[model samples]
Target: HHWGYGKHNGPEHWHKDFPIAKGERQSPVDIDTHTAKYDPSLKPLSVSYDQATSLRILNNGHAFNVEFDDSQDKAVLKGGPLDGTYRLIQFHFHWGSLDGQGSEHTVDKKKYAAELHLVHWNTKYGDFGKAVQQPDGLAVLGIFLKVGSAKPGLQKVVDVLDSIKTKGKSADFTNFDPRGLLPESLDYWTYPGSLTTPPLLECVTWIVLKEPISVSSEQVLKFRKLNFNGEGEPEELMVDNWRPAQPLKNRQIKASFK
Candidate 1:
């Protein structure tokens, strides 16, 4: 009952099928370093790695959003970090057609190979939508992707790609902890920005991890190998579904351990 990859059915081409594509706020562009001004108030209390956290992977056909339920975990960021109860919603990625050269955030117009977004919300503030509109209401843990053997943990995610190869198809995954996904180094850069996707809400406090996570070419292809719909033409498989970079307008990129 599971499907495989195709052209018209790919991620980049999904906008053609779903009209809502024009409205979605997508990620993966390079961050404009020039306009990134630094603010002293923005800093992380600390970064901790949790080995006991569990994961809930939903098979949303074309892409996978790895949900982290930290309700019982010891994950806490106090003081300098936003103090409201924080819960890990889900982690996902954005890639290009053949390679990962067109992510949303760009540095001087240079896109990274790929990008991963770990979204979190302030329980005290409100739901994702509401929190996403308030400064310091949302925190996004960013990880850049390079080509190499540095991403063994990614296998846990990529392994499930074959199951939801077709659009609208998904599977549930549990007992997964995202600690292994963290890059080797904890040093990171912070900034005040909006959702990389549409409705580009300027409410997110971005924490871009300094270290890059490496995944083999084969692993990167797992995402590219997904199809959006089961009924679309065989060539409709999504090859690249990334948004172009956005102007900084008048924003500053901050950091703590930098």
Candidate 2:
């Protein structure tokens, strides 16, 4: 069976194929604010997005992603611990079967309702596949999602989920500005970590925001309706796709704010 968020093939069993799953830089770690160092030298993050770069949305059997065209530096992320420009490749989310237990990363042991990840690749590396194997290859912006008033910026994404409900399904989803989904505060905690999924490469420089964006409970429930199974296959609800927090080991977590 393939790796998934189930008892037989979940995060606990990922080390069988990806040895680095238990490595020192594993991701989705709990951020203890008390222990995080205030790094005055860390630059404020720079984010630039062009609506035309948005290509399509896809259900990859693991999660639904809104992919972007990274051929040029049209939509890019720079600064905030990055050595160079990183092109926006895609963005996706992780959630749970229930309401408040979906976020991959937690703040001082408190979990949010869900989490959003904007995946980017270093321009120097040329492409995502090659970048994944390098130490400074990827930069992922992690934003927490809380249950409250509905987010107007998210409705654009929510409206299209029904069209790609099953695995392998995809549809045109262009001209969407992902920057609108971000919270007002750019304050974040930075750490070096791996992808929280299989092939768990230790290449990501994770920038997790301090503030959370609001989403209606109804909108979050829709995420649970997605199916991991493809068309004509047995239906398996897609939920609890987040990996649990990994060991902190001896890594230092840096904070952008005082």
Candidate 3:
């Protein structure tokens, strides 16, 4: 049985579910920009979205995951996309309790209301599993979400929230390009890192946007409505789904365009 790693099934309990993860590297660090050093002129690598993109919607009843097919043209990433031409593989999210903040990465020890991840693979290099060993083979773009006024941009994702209302339900989406959900400015902070999830391989190149996108309280509530329970099963309501901050290991995080 796969151990769910959330508040109910926290790090203490994850070993019972995935004993191997104990030694892995994790993410969602508390960034200290004022104290941390970096180059200001390092520009964010440009990414293109001209190809047709597809979205795979999976509802485990607790959250939504969107997968992208590499064959889609929209999956293409260029310049700083992945240290090379990488393809958009998939994207997911990590959320938290209504009362408690749920963002994975924090700034200056502050957790945001929510977090979203867009994962890409270096197709020019190799497959995801294989690329896990290379330092620049993977790139993960992160965005912070907070409770605020309803932004029209968020309405797009909210429209699809209903399709996966039940646990274990999944829906396939085409013509659902994700470029719209990105921030207006591409300014970002980049670093060599690893995934926040299991295996926690330190093979990722992370890019966190400086600006946060806002969603209406109602929109966030819709995502919270998910049950967190697996399909065809009964369990506690989904609450904490984020990993705690990881050690920097003395790693240097660089910012683009200064």
Clashing pairs in 3: 40-257, 40-258, 41-258, 42-256, 42-257, 43-257, 51-73, 51-74, 61-167, 62-228
Model 3 C-alpha lDDT per residue in residues 138-192, reported as the tens digit of each score? 8888988877877675676667867776667787766776776777787777777
Better of 1 and 2 by TM-score: 2
* lDDT (tens digit, per residue) of candidate 2 on 1-258: 889887798889989988999899999999999999999999999988754388999999989999998888888899998899999999999998887799999999998889999999999988999999998899999999999999998988888999999999999998888978999999999999999998999999999999999999889988988998899898889999999899999899999999
Clashes of each: 34, 0, 10
- Tens digit of lDDT per residue, candidate 1, span 1-258? 222233334334444544434442333335655545444665444544463354556545435677665564345333344565555677777677755483556566766677788777777765666777676677777777777774778887888877767756556677666676778775556656656544456566667776777788888877777665663547345554456654443444554442
Clashes of 2: 0
Model 1, C-alpha of 66: deviation from truth (Å)? 0.9
RMSD of 1: 5.2
How do the candidates rank by TM-score, highest first? 2, 3, 1
Task: Report, for every candidate in turn, its global Cα lDDT versus the true structure.
Answer: 0.61, 0.92, 0.70
Q: TM-scores of all models? A: 0.75, 0.98, 0.87
lDDT minimum window of 10 residues, candidate 3: 17-26
